[PDB]
Amino acid sequence: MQIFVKTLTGKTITLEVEPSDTIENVKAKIQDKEGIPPDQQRLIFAGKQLEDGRTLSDYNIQKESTLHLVLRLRGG
């Protein structure tokens, strides 16, 4: 199963994933492809922000669904 992640540059990232994969997993995949620390990643699907400990399926993300990636700094 593949999904797509759209970045701030309009680039589409293609990820090989499973329905049971977590959001944290998906962000770790993005870090591998792009080099972006997961704590700076905000994933959005259907306009809703996605929580680290939840599965893709929990958000009804399906084969070849597209997510949006927003990047934010963290100051603590």
Partner: protein, 34 residues
């Protein structure tokens, strides 16, 4: 000028012209990973 949302997907910050329509924050990230 009038106001405009950042051109980055799903970003709801305001963009500016010095950053080509992105907000400052996305423009920083863009200078890094773009």
């Amino acid at each position: 000028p009038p106001k405009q949302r950042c051109r980055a997907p799903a970003c709801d910050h305001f963009g500016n012209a010095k950053c080509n329509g992105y907000c400052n924050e996305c423009f920083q990230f863009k200078q890094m990973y773009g």
